[PDB]
Amino acid sequence: NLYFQSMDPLLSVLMWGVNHSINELSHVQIPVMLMPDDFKAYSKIKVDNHLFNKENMPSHFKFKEYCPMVFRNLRERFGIDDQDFQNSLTRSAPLPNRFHTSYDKRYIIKTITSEDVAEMHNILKKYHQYIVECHGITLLPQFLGMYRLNVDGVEIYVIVTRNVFSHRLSVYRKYDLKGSREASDKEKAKELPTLKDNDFINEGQKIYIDDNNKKVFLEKLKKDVEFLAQLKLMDYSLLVGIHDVERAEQEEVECPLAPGEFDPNIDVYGIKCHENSPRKEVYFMAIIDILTHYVNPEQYSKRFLDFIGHIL
Amino acid sequence: LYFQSMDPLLSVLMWGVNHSINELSHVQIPVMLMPDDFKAYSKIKVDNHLFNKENMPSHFKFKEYCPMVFRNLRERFGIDDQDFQNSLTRSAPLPNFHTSYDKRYIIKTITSEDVAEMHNILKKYHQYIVECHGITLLPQFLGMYRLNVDGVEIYVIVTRNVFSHRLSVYRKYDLKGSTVAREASDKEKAKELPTLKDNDFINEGQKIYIDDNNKKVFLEKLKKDVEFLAQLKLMDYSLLVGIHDVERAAPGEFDPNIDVYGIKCHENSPRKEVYFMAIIDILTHYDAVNPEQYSKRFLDFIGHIL
Ligand SMILES: CC[C@@H](Nc1c(C#N)c(-c2ccc(-c3cccc(C)c3F)cc2)nc2cnccc12)C(=O)O
Ligand SMILES: CC[C@@H](Nc1c(C#N)c(-c2ccc(-c3cccc(C)c3F)cc2)nc2cnccc12)C(=O)O
Incomplete structure (x- = not known):
């Protein structure tokens, strides 16, 4: 089945966190419209396993999803089902080229800086309103999810976009x-x-x-x-x-x-x-x-x- | 399913059991348990900011004790993990201890002494359940957890009704x-x-x-x-x-x-x-x-x- 194994522990955590994120959202009302607080929201998860699943996964990691409600809405507006998205990023490890591509070649995953993250929040309201007004018909990058990973004291921010x-x-x-x-x-x-x-x-x-x-x-x-x-x-x-x-x-x-x-x-x-x-x-x-x-x-x-x- | 409750400890428990069983679906069913499985645990700490603020508390911890051992006991007691997850998740447990909504399971708050004493007996208990092929009138211990929410920490056990x-x-x-009163x-x-x-x-x-x-x-x-x-x-x-x-x-x-x-x-x-x-x-x-x-x-x- 799905174990989220990789030689790359950052990929393992990314696969686990996207799996986690999407299952979490499966237990959260789809709102009639996004509100201002959804543009400043996050979820943080810290895992500490002891003598459990020790071969497949790192035992100690953090995963944080930025504005989960906004990126769920953006997926929807760009015609992406959350189940398909979850499968694309977790059913098998993303392949490297620096960027990675989902195993099914649907999606691009890219490491980004905290400045990039700060600048994403700066444009996020305006980006979302634009995507509404062009009914998702644009040549712009489709920003589908945005995360912070921490394993073995290595911290990265990542964006997912449409190939x-x-x-x-x-x-x-x-x-x-x-x-x-x-x-x-x-x-x-x-x-x-x-x-x-x-x-x-x-x-x-x-x-x-x-x-x-x-x-x-x-x-x-x-x-x-x-x-x-x-x-x-x-x-x-x-x-x-x-x-x-x-x-x-x-x-x-x-x-x-x-x-x-x-x-x-x-x-x-x-x-x-x-x-x-x-x-x-x-x-x-x-x-x-x-x-x-x-x-x-x-x-x-x-x-x-x-x-x-x-x-x- | 939103794991809503008036009692924030039930929401975390429902969230926790739902997490625990989804996690184990991403973990290999071993050919047999090993000694480290009787000292193992998984802790998840959740911190939400302006996300799922109405249904769930924003700050909580959930710990499962010896997850590999309790999954093996469920199987040895004729209990599928999905049906287990459903019994403890599809709707809140009702207080009388608590009973799962479908009346299949008991949920009880225990002490850390109880938790320490369960680890002390868990190897012998498991091997007893192996040797009687699940056929016993002993309590079926089906999962054991620790919940924190709003700085309130409880230990909970789940048994069959x-x-x-x-x-x-x-x-x-x-x-x-x-002989006494x-x-x-x-x-x-x-x-x-x-x-x-x-x-x-x-x-x-x-x-x-x-x-x-x-x-x-x-x-x-x-x-x-x-x-x-x-x-x-x-x-x-x-x-x-x-x-x-x-x-x-x-x-x-x-x-x-x-x-x-x-x-x-x-x-x-x-x-x-x-x-x-x-x-x-x-x-x-x-000893007490x-x-x-x-x-x-x-x-x-x-x-x-x-
Ligand atoms: C020519 C570049 C590269 N491949 C690609 C990259 C890369 N790299 C990106 C990409 C994604 C994200 C960022 C980014 C960088 C910083 C911040 C924030 C938010 C970002 F989205 C920057 C570039 N998208 C692609 C879409 N389809 C196909 C190939 C792609 C290649 O073939 O060499
Ligand atoms: C008669 C008492 C009560 N009902 C029940 C209780 C209780 N209480 C328990 C129960 C579960 C766990 C512990 C426990 C206590 C401490 C430590 C550790 C590990 C434990 F399992 C102690 C008792 N099981 C039941 C099973 N089927 C039906 C009713 C049950 C009632 O109706 O009033």
């Missing part, structure tokens, strides 16, 4: 895009380099989405980017993953959803290529890495939109 | 076979169900009518159980006897996998009755008449009344 990329379709090419930045020699020798602004230009990278999806996509991005500028946030990226249908076919032939198809209620950032693309590709594109508080944010926001618009 | 989860008891005796008070006797005692049993001319076979099997168990208690040098235990009157009314019947202490009366009983008989309240050590004597005086009496 920009597909849980199923492989990404053969990947870009972190800002505007106004090229991968190192070391980065480029990996299997999947995180390529950057100059790699995008100098490799002659094109993205082939039809006028309609381009308009829809640049309309969200403008709204999301203007919201980030009102918050006075900057140094955020567009993450672009490219799925090449034909490369994934030959990669697999060596060893019901058709090739180049995805479920848009799971792979929410997916966009099909247009009819006249030289190759059958699927693009996965959203905003990551939002949380730098004040170029100025106006300037950052306009340069970003201008660079993304000039590449489509 | 001697009485039925459905059939009513119209008459009830705490029997020891002590054992008589329920005038206050006790005015209650709807008084706990009657040895001299009430004799002075009321109470009869238990069970056939020669069930009496032999009952007295064989009681003897082995009571010789075990003497070996441990425990005393001051009682036979608890509940009598269900079938006539006040299928009527005569009960599931003997649920109500395990039930025994039907003799066919030639003048009154249709069902008897619920077992040992309670064993944890008094001699001796345990041999108590045990011998206790059996002579129970055999004297059947």
Whole structure:
């Protein structure tokens, strides 16, 4: 069954605490609406086992969940069931790349600083009201839970976000895009380099989405980017993953959803290529890495939109 | 399920049992218990800030003693952990000790001396339950915990109800076979169900009518159980006897996998009755008449009344 075992005791506690958190919330009324106190709330749990479950789990740890009611509501508004979320993060250990990915590739887990946590509380009310008003249709990072772990006197804060990329379709090419930045020699020798602004230009990278999806996509991005500028946030990226249908076919032939198809209620950032693309590709594109508080944010926001618009 | 109660100690207990059993579903069923399992425990301390503030207290501790041992005893007593969790969780235990909402379990506040004395006997108790294959009139110890809330600390034990989860008891005796004054008070006797005692049993001319076979099997168990208690040098235990009157009314019947202490009366009983008989309240050590004597005086009496 589920033992939450890992060589990494921080992962064990994270799996245990997400399991704990979600079961706890199963015993707490879903409120008609969130209230101000829910934006300053937490749960702290300290465990001290003696000669009990000593092989699977560390015997001494702390787990703290920030604003559990808000992040439950955000999961709901982003179309996530708490049971599915719990399974995604606990049924098997998250895999490392620094970030981790849930075993089913739905979710990203990232270590963050206490400043980041303090800045999350600073934006949390405004972020939640924005998510309500766009009915959860945004390119913004979906913040799904936020925790503090302590084991063996090692303290970390972690955020969970939705994977920009597909849980199923492989990404053969990947870009972190800002505007106004090229991968190192070391980065480029990996299997999947995180390529950057100059790699995008100098490799002659094109993205082939039809006028309609381009308009829809640049309309969200403008709204999301203007919201980030009102918050006075900057140094955020567009993450672009490219799925090449034909490369994934030959990669697999060596060893019901058709090739180049995805479920848009799971792979929410997916966009099909247009009819006249030289190759059958699927693009996965959203905003990551939002949380730098004040170029100025106006300037950052306009340069970003201008660079993304000039590449489509 | 919100584990709501007017009594914050019941909420933590319900929360605690719910936590304890969910935890053990993430822990391997071992091939056998080992010595460290009789010294083990799990403590959880909870501190909430503006979260679940209405249903639950914001600050509490729950400790389970020897979790691996109590899970093994539940299984050896024919008790599934989910059904156990449900009996203690789906709805609050009712005060009279307390009874689970479905009347399957007793919940009782004990002292830290009681807790220390349970650890002292727990290895021998478990190995006794192994050797009698769960077939005993001893108390079934099903879990043992420590709760803190609002700086108030209690220890609690959970045992199986001697009485039925459905059939009513119209008459009830705490029997020891002590020669001394054992008589329920005038206050006790005015209650709807008084706990009657040895001299009430004799002075009321109470009869238990069970056939020669069930009496032999009952007295064989009681003897082995009571010789075990003497070996441990425990005393001051009682036979608890509940009598269900079938006539006040299928009527005569009960599931003997649920109500395990039930025994039907003799066919030639003048009154249709069902008897619920077992040992309670064993944890008094001699160190504090001796345990041999108590045990011998206790059996002579129970055999004297059947
Ligand atoms: C290109 C970066 C990296 N992969 C990813 C990262 C990372 N890293 C993040 C991510 C999550 C959280 C933070 C974060 C950092 C600080 C504070 C707070 C709140 C945060 F959310 C920052 C970045 N999201 C991803 C979504 N989909 C796919 C890949 C992702 C890679 O492939 O190299
Ligand atoms: C006749 C007394 C009372 N009812 C009961 C009690 C009580 N009290 C107990 C009980 C449980 C635990 C301890 C205990 C006490 C100290 C230490 C440790 C470990 C213990 F288990 C002592 C007694 N069991 C019952 C089982 N079935 C039915 C009724 C029961 C009543 O009706 O008035």
